[PDB]
């Protein structure tokens, strides 16, 4: 019934159809990652360790990863965050030497707040980085932590109030049986960044791979 | 009892 | 650069075997559907055969279909004819012509320049009655092509196509599907007609427009020509 | 200081005293006696199966037939609605895509996103190819919104809280449409194109003027973010979806809302809308994962278009009136009619 | 008679697992067919819910052979078919749970691996493959499955002497090839994949609900319970004299109806996540 | 925020300087256009399925 144009049309889109599912394919395993963060907060060293939007390419032991750095988008941010519902893990960069420079600890923790508990990301688990550990460490002596947070009935050393800070943090969660959060303590810059990244990013893949087999 | 009756094979 | 060039023509003993190629240059290759079309040395235009894009669908005209093999290497941008047991019949010049369908393209639109084989010694007809028709400069001249059968689809097209062969040139698509004017046609160039019986009307004709006009159907495989409607003085 | 602050609240008191004037009758109380349209019952004619993510923007061909949508798995696919056939698939630089235009000649494609860039797409190529014509770059913010103009003219809509108009075959902004305070949403062309409405983020809906380019008028009302507008056909009124759940109808001579489009039961934001031809049906994609017909002059509801497994993002009417495109986060657009 | 009313009771679940297999796999072939994407597990649960829906489909065949006393009326190549069908199907739905537990398997102990090298072109092979043997394996039911008519009574049999010790070897080659590589391999290979999930899902604690490790018992207990009866019936019918003909003239139809039963239960035993909802969405 | 302030007053003062029309004179407008044009509205009126272009 078809014209020989007409059948030549169809074979065309055929093919073109051929090769959006194989770009499909191709495309559906890449690893995901959307690189959040309050302001400069070690985003660019972990950047470096792995317009408005900066994708990041890069390959750790067989695994293809995307990093979308979108610190750039000085625009509200509720109009575009869906766009990411779906990614595969959010890496949250704190920068915890600022929990005394101007109170930008506590704008880091209402993003974090922000972002964790959004609608979109209810299954999307995070790798909080916690970064500048060194000036945090030989800071932490001079200035007390009290200065952050007043209710800190803890020793101004560091072992203790990074654990504070962590567990702050992770107390944000309100979604504490559908999404996990992987904290990192990184100022080594021994490799160690992509390395949790790759284990919590396996992890995160496992459990997805259950959800889709139906297993679940 | 022929073999292969009452089932399927 | 959009150039097609044939190669592998010449002088065959009858009953032989000879390759012909046409290396494309200068458009995406592997999104166009290949024809090959032949002309005798005093007679017009005639289908030979046609590879899909993918390489997925073939047609031969009837009286090759078995002798002839058209094949396509994408990756090295060439069209291939393999021809075995060149009879008499077969002595022509071929041409590598590129075609795209998807709604409203325009196929048949660039035609290679065409190479020379000599091989030493239902179907829908398409009738140009006028074989010759003398016409001066300036002046207006309309071009009548009848069929056979009705070419306008029930999809609303008529597979009706124009073609010019400018004396010692290759073919040059003017009007396809019966209506529509392709890219580089001065607008003078005009198509129109029911089923079954078309005009093309150069308006103001002036040098260059002197040749041979040729009228393909595209309803339905093989394509057919027309004999030619030959322009002088 | 103070004495100018002073000065502008007197200027708007003073502007919405005037537009309370003119104000004697509602469209409601105009509109009482027609018959109502009754029940618009459209079936899927329709549906497109190539996309592989959420579709985020589509836009008809003034031929009525042919179609563009974006999505982001990274593709521009260009559909014949009448065959189902896929004409062209456009591979995108950056997949994070937000909107999609249809050059009124059919040419040219443009597409843009949270790259702040503007792609300009060259159809018909003697090459056989779609090709990047010219990027268009100078937005600091998210591409909302593109329209064409003509061949060689787009305004664009940014989330930077300006709307830009440009000249292609430069690529420089010949004019910036600087008048908003929050991210400028949505874009509609006027039938005449010497001027259009963008909705942004403040809850109000700005008219510009393409040739002269300022803000001849603001519309105020909505009471959350503006996500879609669209000209009423006459090109004297137009159409806004806001997050509030609600669409509002404005009209620029008149200068203030004429009617509400809103019900008890939607509660959800409305992400597309679309008039049609005659102008008496306005059509609104939803949060519902659905959309909605609106008998225009009655506020009434006069259909839904439910056939969608997510948000309705993009919606269009052909420029003959014949069908309505819908496409969606599932990964699905839908032809109705 | 109890033996009449046992049969009665017999093709009463026959024919209500029949149905059921009919309802579930056409649902699930509708939603493999139009709703969810075609990735690497949709190929799997498509053609697992064809080889069921096939085979629940030639069912009523058998089951109008049950509803009166064993009485075939049919002739030989309604034998043939009917019971080629019956066991290439059984051996495609066996090796495809197989190759879905390996699937799962790989999935969580080489999660990269998987990302990096699981595609529908691979799947597509590997149920290709999967058809191919069942076939090869199911061949037997063409060759034998004559039909006999005695005293009056005539009754589709597996005819291993093609109207004696050939006629024995080819019958003992045949069950237990079937039985190898039917019960036996699959069921080591479905138990060692779903027990390395569980082991892994302990060591790395992944779980945090109790339905992933109920889904794999019941997966595992049913495909055993199911499919034992069946093959270990027919593994006692070589040297059948030894044995009361009351044994297999009971045992055989009650191993039947566990079977039919496996065919109609796995696909709501595998099809269960977000398809459904998306159904009860529509 | 000197600049900002002038500014706004100056694009107030112009949108306070355009002529209205009635409100019932707009919505009289709105009206006869969607009478004017409801045979050419094949959403309005659903044409058979002759002519429909998306059939199937
Ligand atoms: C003896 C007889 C029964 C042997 C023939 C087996 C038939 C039923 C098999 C052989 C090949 C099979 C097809 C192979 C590939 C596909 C695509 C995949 O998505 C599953 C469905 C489908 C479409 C299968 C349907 C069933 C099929 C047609
Ligand atoms: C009955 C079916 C399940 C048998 C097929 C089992 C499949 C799943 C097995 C057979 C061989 C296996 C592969 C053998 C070796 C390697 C290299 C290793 O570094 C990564 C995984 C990989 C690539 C294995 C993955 C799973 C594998 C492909
Ligand atoms: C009990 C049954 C299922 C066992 C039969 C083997 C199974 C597991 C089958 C199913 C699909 C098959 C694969 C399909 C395609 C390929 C392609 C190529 O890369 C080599 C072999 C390989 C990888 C096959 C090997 C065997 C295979 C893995
Ligand atoms: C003839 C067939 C239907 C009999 C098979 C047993 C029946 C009763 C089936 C139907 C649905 C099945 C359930 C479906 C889903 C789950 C998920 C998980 O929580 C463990 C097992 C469990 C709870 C299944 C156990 C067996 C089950 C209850
Ligand atoms: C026709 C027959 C085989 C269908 C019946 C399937 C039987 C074997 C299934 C149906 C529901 C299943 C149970 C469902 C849930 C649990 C959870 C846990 O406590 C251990 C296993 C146990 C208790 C399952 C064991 C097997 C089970 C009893």
Same mark, same amino acid.
């Given at each position: 019934?078809?014209?020989?144009?007409?059948?030549?049309?169809?074979?065309?889109?055929?093919?073109?159809?051929?090769?959006?599912?194989?770009?499909?394919?191709?495309?559906?395993?890449?690893?995901?990652?959307?690189?959040?963060?309050?302001?400069?907060?070690? =985003?660019?060293?972990?950047?470096?360790?792995?317009?408005?939007?900066?994708?990041?390419?890069?390959?750790?032991?067989?695994?293809?990863?995307?990093?979308?750095?979108?610190?750039?988008?000085?625009?509200?941010?509720?109009?575009?965050?869906?766009?990411?519902?779906?990614?595969?893990?959010?890496?949250?960069?704190?920068?915890?030497?600022?929990?005394?420079?101007?109170?930008?600890?506590?704008?880091?923790? =209402?993003?974090?707040?922000?972002?964790?508990?959004?609608?979109?990301?209810?299954?999307?688990?995070?790798?909080?980085?916690?970064? =500048?550990?060194?000036?945090?460490?030989?800071?932490?002596? =001079?200035?007390?932590?009290?200065?952050?947070?007043?209710?800190?009935?803890?020793?101004?050393?560091?072992?203790?109030?990074?654990?504070?800070?962590?567990?702050?943090?992770?107390?944000?969660?309100?979604?504490?049986?559908?999404?996990?959060?992987?904290?990192?303590?990184?100022?080594?810059?021994?490799?160690?960044?992509?390395?949790?990244?790759?284990?919590?990013?396996?992890?995160?893949?496992?459990?997805?791979?259950?959800?889709?087999?139906?297993?679940? | 009892?022929?073999?292969?009756?009452?089932?399927?094979? | 650069?959009?150039?097609?060039?044939?190669?592998?023509?010449?002088?065959?003993?009858?009953?032989?075997?000879?390759?012909?190629?046409?290396?494309?240059?200068?458009?995406?290759?592997?999104?166009?559907?290949?024809?090959?079309?032949?002309?005798?040395?005093?007679?017009?235009?005639?289908?030979?055969?046609?590879?899909?894009?993918?390489?997925?669908?073939?047609?031969?005209?009837?009286?090759?279909?078995?002798?002839?093999?058209?094949?396509?290497?994408?990756?090295?941008?060439?069209?291939?004819?393999?021809?075995?047991?060149?009879?008499?019949?077969?002595?022509?010049?071929?041409?590598?012509?590129?075609?795209?369908?998807?709604?409203?393209?325009?196929?048949?639109?660039?035609?290679?320049?065409?190479?020379?084989?000599?091989?030493?010694?239902?179907?829908?007809?398409?009738?140009?009655?006028?074989?010759?028709?003398?016409?001066?400069?300036?002046?207006?001249?309309?071009?009548?092509?009848?069929?056979?059968?009705?070419?306008?689809?029930?999809?609303?097209?008529?597979?009706?196509?124009?073609?010019?062969?400018?004396?010692?040139?290759?073919?040059?698509?003017?009007?396809?599907?019966?209506?529509?004017?392709?890219?580089?046609?001065?607008?003078?160039?005009?198509?129109?007609?029911?089923?079954?019986?078309?005009?093309?009307?150069?308006?103001?004709?002036?040098?260059?427009?002197?040749?041979?006009?040729?009228?393909?159907?595209?309803?339905?495989?093989?394509?057919?020509?027309?004999?030619?409607?030959?322009?002088?003085? | 200081?103070?004495?100018?602050?002073?000065?502008?609240?007197?200027?708007?008191?003073?502007?919405?005293?005037?537009?309370?004037?003119?104000?004697?009758?509602?469209?409601?109380?105009?509109?009482?006696?027609?018959?109502?349209?009754?029940?618009?019952?459209?079936?899927?004619?329709?549906?497109?199966?190539?996309?592989?993510?959420?579709?985020?923007?589509?836009?008809?061909?003034?031929?009525?037939?042919?179609?563009?949508?974006?999505?982001?798995?990274?593709?521009?696919?260009?559909?014949?609605?009448?065959?189902?056939?896929?004409?062209?698939?456009?591979?995108?630089?950056?997949?994070?895509?937000?909107?999609?235009?249809?050059?009124?000649?059919?040419?040219?494609?443009?597409?843009?996103?949270?790259?702040?860039?503007?792609?300009?797409?060259?159809?018909?190529?003697?090459?056989?190819?779609?090709?990047?014509?010219?990027?268009?770059?100078?937005?600091?913010?998210?591409?909302?919104?593109?329209?064409?103009?003509?061949?060689?003219?787009?305004?664009?809509?940014?989330?930077?809280?300006?709307?830009?108009?440009?000249?292609?075959?430069?690529?420089?902004?010949?004019?910036?449409?600087?008048?908003?305070?929050?991210?400028?949403?949505?874009?509609?062309?006027?039938?005449?194109?010497?001027?259009?409405?963008?909705?942004?983020?403040?809850?109000?809906?700005?008219?510009?003027?393409?040739?002269?380019?300022?803000?001849?008028?603001?519309?105020?009302?909505?009471?959350?973010?503006?996500?879609?507008?669209?000209?009423?056909?006459?090109?004297?009124?137009?159409?806004?979806?806001?997050?509030?759940?609600?669409?509002?109808?404005?009209?620029?001579?008149?200068?203030?809302?004429?009617?509400?489009?809103?019900?008890?039961?939607?509660?959800?934001?409305?992400?597309?809308?679309?008039?049609?031809?005659?102008?008496?049906?306005?059509?609104?994609?939803?949060?519902?994962?659905?959309?909605?017909?609106?008998?225009?002059?009655?506020?009434?509801?006069?259909?839904?278009?439910?056939?969608?497994?997510?948000?309705?993002?993009?919606?269009?009417?052909?420029?003959?009136?014949?069908?309505?495109?819908?496409?969606?986060?599932?990964?699905?657009?839908?032809?109705?009619? | 008679?109890?033996?009449?009313?046992?049969?009665?009771?017999?093709?009463?679940?026959?024919?209500?697992?029949?149905?059921?297999?009919?309802?579930?796999?056409?649902?699930?072939?509708?939603?493999?067919?139009?709703?969810?994407?075609?990735?690497?597990?949709?190929?799997?649960?498509?053609?697992?819910?064809?080889?069921?829906?096939?085979?629940?489909?030639?069912?009523?065949?058998?089951?109008?052979?049950?509803?009166?006393?064993?009485?075939?009326?049919?002739?030989?190549?309604?034998?043939?078919?009917?019971?080629?069908?019956?066991?290439?199907?059984?051996?495609?739905?066996?090796?495809?749970?197989?190759?879905?537990?390996?699937?799962?398997?790989?999935?969580?102990?080489?999660?990269?691996?998987?990302?990096?090298?699981?595609?529908?072109?691979?799947?597509?092979?590997?149920?290709?493959?999967?058809?191919?043997?069942?076939?090869?394996?199911?061949?037997?039911?063409?060759?034998?499955?004559?039909?006999?008519?005695?005293?009056?009574?005539?009754?589709?049999?597996?005819?291993?002497?093609?109207?004696?010790?050939?006629?024995?070897?080819?019958?003992?080659?045949?069950?237990?090839?079937?039985?190898?590589?039917?019960?036996?391999?699959?069921?080591?290979?479905?138990?060692?994949?779903?027990?390395?999930?569980?082991?892994?899902?302990?060591?790395?604690?992944?779980?945090?609900?109790?339905?992933?490790?109920?889904?794999?018992?019941?997966?595992?207990?049913?495909?055993?319970?199911?499919?034992?009866?069946?093959?270990?019936?027919?593994?006692?019918?070589?040297?059948?004299?030894?044995?009361?003909?009351?044994?297999?003239?009971?045992?055989?139809?009650?191993?039947?109806?566990?079977?039919?039963?496996?065919?109609?239960?796995?696909?709501?035993?595998?099809?269960?996540?977000?398809?459904?909802?998306?159904?009860?969405?529509? | 925020?000197?600049?900002?302030?002038?500014?706004?007053?100056?694009?107030?003062?112009?949108?306070?300087?355009?002529?209205?029309?009635?409100?019932?004179?707009?919505?009289?407008?709105?009206?006869?256009?969607?009478?004017?044009?409801?045979?050419?509205?094949?959403?309005?009126?659903?044409?058979?399925?002759?002519?429909?272009?998306?059939?199937?």
């Amino acid at each position: 019934t078809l014209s020989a144009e007409d059948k030549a049309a169809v074979e065309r889109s055929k093919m073109i159809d051929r090769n959006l599912r194989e770009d499909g394919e191709k495309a559906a395993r890449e690893v995901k990652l959307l690189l959040l963060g309050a302001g400069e907060s070690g =985003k660019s060293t972990i950047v470096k360790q792995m317009t408005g939007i900066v994708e990041t390419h890069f390959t750790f032991k067989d695994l293809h990863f995307k990093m979308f750095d979108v610190g750039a988008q000085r625009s509200e941010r509720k109009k575009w965050i869906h766009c990411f519902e779906g990614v595969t893990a959010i890496i949250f960069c704190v920068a915890l030497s600022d929990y005394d420079l101007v109170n930008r600890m506590h704008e880091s923790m =209402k993003l974090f707040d922000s972002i964790c508990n959004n609608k979109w990301f209810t299954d999307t688990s995070i790798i909080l980085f916690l970064n =500048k550990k060194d000036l945090f460490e030989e800071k932490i002596k =001079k200035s007390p932590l009290t200065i952050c947070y007043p209710e800190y009935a803890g020793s101004n050393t560091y072992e203790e109030a990074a654990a504070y800070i962590q567990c702050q943090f992770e107390d944000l969660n309100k979604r504490k049986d559908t999404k996990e959060i992987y904290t990192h303590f990184t100022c080594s810059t021994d490799t160690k960044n992509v390395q949790f990244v790759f284990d919590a990013v396996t992890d995160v893949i496992i459990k997805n791979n259950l959800k889709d087999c139906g297993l679940f | 009892y022929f073999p292969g009756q009452f089932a399927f094979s | 650069d959009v150039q097609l060039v044939e190669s592998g023509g010449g002088l065959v003993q009858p009953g032989g075997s000879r390759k012909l190629s046409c290396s494309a240059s200068g458009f995406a290759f592997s999104s166009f559907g290949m024809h090959w079309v032949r002309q005798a040395p005093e007679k017009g235009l005639e289908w030979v055969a046609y590879i899909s894009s993918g390489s997925g669908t073939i047609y031969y005209a009837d009286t090759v279909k078995g002798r002839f093999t058209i094949s396509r290497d994408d990756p090295k941008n060439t069209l291939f004819l393999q021809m075995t047991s060149l009879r008499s019949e077969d002595t022509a010049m071929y041409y590598c012509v590129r075609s795209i369908y998807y709604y409203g393209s325009s196929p048949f639109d660039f035609w290679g320049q065409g190479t020379t084989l000599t091989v030493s010694s239902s179907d829908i007809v398409m009738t140009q009655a006028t074989s010759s028709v003398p016409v001066t400069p300036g002046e207006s001249v309309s071009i009548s092509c009848r069929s056979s059968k009705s070419l306008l689809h029930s999809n609303g097209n008529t597979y009706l196509y124009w073609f010019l062969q400018r004396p010692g040139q290759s073919p040059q698509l003017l009007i396809y599907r019966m209506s529509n004017l392709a890219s580089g046609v001065p607008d003078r160039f005009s198509g129109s007609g029911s089923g079954t019986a078309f005009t093309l009307t150069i308006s103001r004709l002036e040098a260059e427009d002197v040749g041979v006009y040729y009228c393909m159907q595209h309803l339905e495989y093989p394509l057919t020509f027309g004999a030619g409607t030959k322009l002088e003085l | 200081l103070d004495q100018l602050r002073q000065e502008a609240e007197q200027l708007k008191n003073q502007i919405r005293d005037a537009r309370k004037a003119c104000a004697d009758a509602t469209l409601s109380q105009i509109t009482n006696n027609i018959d109502p349209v009754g029940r618009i019952q459209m079936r899927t004619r329709r549906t497109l199966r190539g996309h592989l993510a959420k579709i985020y923007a589509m836009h008809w061909g003034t031929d009525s037939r042919l179609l563009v949508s974006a999505s982001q798995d990274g593709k521009l696919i260009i559909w014949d609605s009448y065959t189902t056939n896929k004409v062209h698939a456009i591979p995108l630089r950056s997949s994070w895509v937000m909107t999609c235009a249809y050059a009124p000649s059919g040419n040219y494609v443009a597409c843009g996103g949270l790259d702040n860039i503007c792609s300009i797409y060259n159809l018909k190529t003697r090459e056989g190819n779609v090709r990047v014509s010219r990027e268009l770059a100078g937005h600091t913010g998210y591409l909302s919104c593109c329209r064409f103009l003509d061949d060689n003219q787009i305004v664009t809509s940014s989330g930077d809280t300006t709307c830009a108009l440009w000249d292609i075959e430069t690529g420089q902004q010949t004019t910036t449409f600087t008048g908003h305070t929050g991210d400028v949403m949505s874009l509609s062309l006027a039938p005449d194109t010497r001027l259009f409405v963008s909705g942004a983020c403040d809850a109000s809906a700005k008219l510009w003027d393409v040739r002269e380019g300022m803000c001849r008028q603001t519309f105020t009302g909505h009471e959350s973010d503006i996500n879609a507008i669209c000209f009423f056909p006459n090109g004297n009124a137009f159409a806004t979806g806001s997050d509030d759940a609600t669409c509002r109808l404005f009209d620029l001579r008149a200068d203030q809302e004429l009617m509400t489009y809103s019900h008890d039961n939607i509660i959800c934001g409305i992400t597309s809308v679309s008039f049609s031809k005659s102008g008496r049906l306005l059509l609104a994609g939803y949060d519902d994962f659905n959309c909605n017909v609106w008998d225009a002059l009655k506020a009434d509801r006069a259909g839904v278009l439910a056939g969608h497994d997510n948000r309705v993002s993009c919606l269009g009417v052909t420029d003959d009136g014949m069908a309505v495109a819908t496409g969606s986060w599932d990964s699905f657009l839908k032809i109705w009619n | 008679l109890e033996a009449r009313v046992t049969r009665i009771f017999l093709v009463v679940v026959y024919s209500i697992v029949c149905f059921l297999g009919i309802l579930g796999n056409g649902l699930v072939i509708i939603i493999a067919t139009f709703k969810m994407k075609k990735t690497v597990n949709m190929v799997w649960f498509l053609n697992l819910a064809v080889a069921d829906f096939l085979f629940n489909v030639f069912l009523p065949i058998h089951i109008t052979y049950a509803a009166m006393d064993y009485h075939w009326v049919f002739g030989t190549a309604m034998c043939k078919i009917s019971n080629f069908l019956l066991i290439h199907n059984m051996f495609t739905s066996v090796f495809l749970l197989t190759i879905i537990s390996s699937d799962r398997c790989i999935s969580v102990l080489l999660p990269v691996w998987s990302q990096n090298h699981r595609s529908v072109r691979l799947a597509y092979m590997a149920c290709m493959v999967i058809w191919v043997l069942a076939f090869f394996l199911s061949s037997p039911s063409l060759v034998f499955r004559d039909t006999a008519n005695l005293h009056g009574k005539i009754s589709c049999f597996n005819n291993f002497s093609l109207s004696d010790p050939v006629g024995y070897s080819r019958h003992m080659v045949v069950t237990v090839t079937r039985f190898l590589c039917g019960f036996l391999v699959p069921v080591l290979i479905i138990t060692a994949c779903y027990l390395t999930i569980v082991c892994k899902l302990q060591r790395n604690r992944l779980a945090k609900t109790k339905k992933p490790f109920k889904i794999i018992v019941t997966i595992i207990i049913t495909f055993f319970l199911c499919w034992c009866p069946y093959h270990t019936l027919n593994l006692l019918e070589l040297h059948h004299t030894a044995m009361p003909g009351s044994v297999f003239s009971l045992g055989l139809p009650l191993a039947t109806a566990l079977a039919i039963a496996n065919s109609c239960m796995n696909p709501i035993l595998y099809v269960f996540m977000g398809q459904d909802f998306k159904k009860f969405k529509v | 925020s000197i600049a900002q302030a002038r500014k706004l007053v100056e694009q107030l003062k112009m949108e306070a300087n355009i002529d209205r029309i009635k409100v019932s004179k707009a919505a009289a407008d709105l009206m006869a256009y969607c009478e004017a044009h409801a045979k050419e509205d094949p959403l309005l009126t659903p044409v058979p399925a002759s002519e429909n272009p998306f059939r199937e």
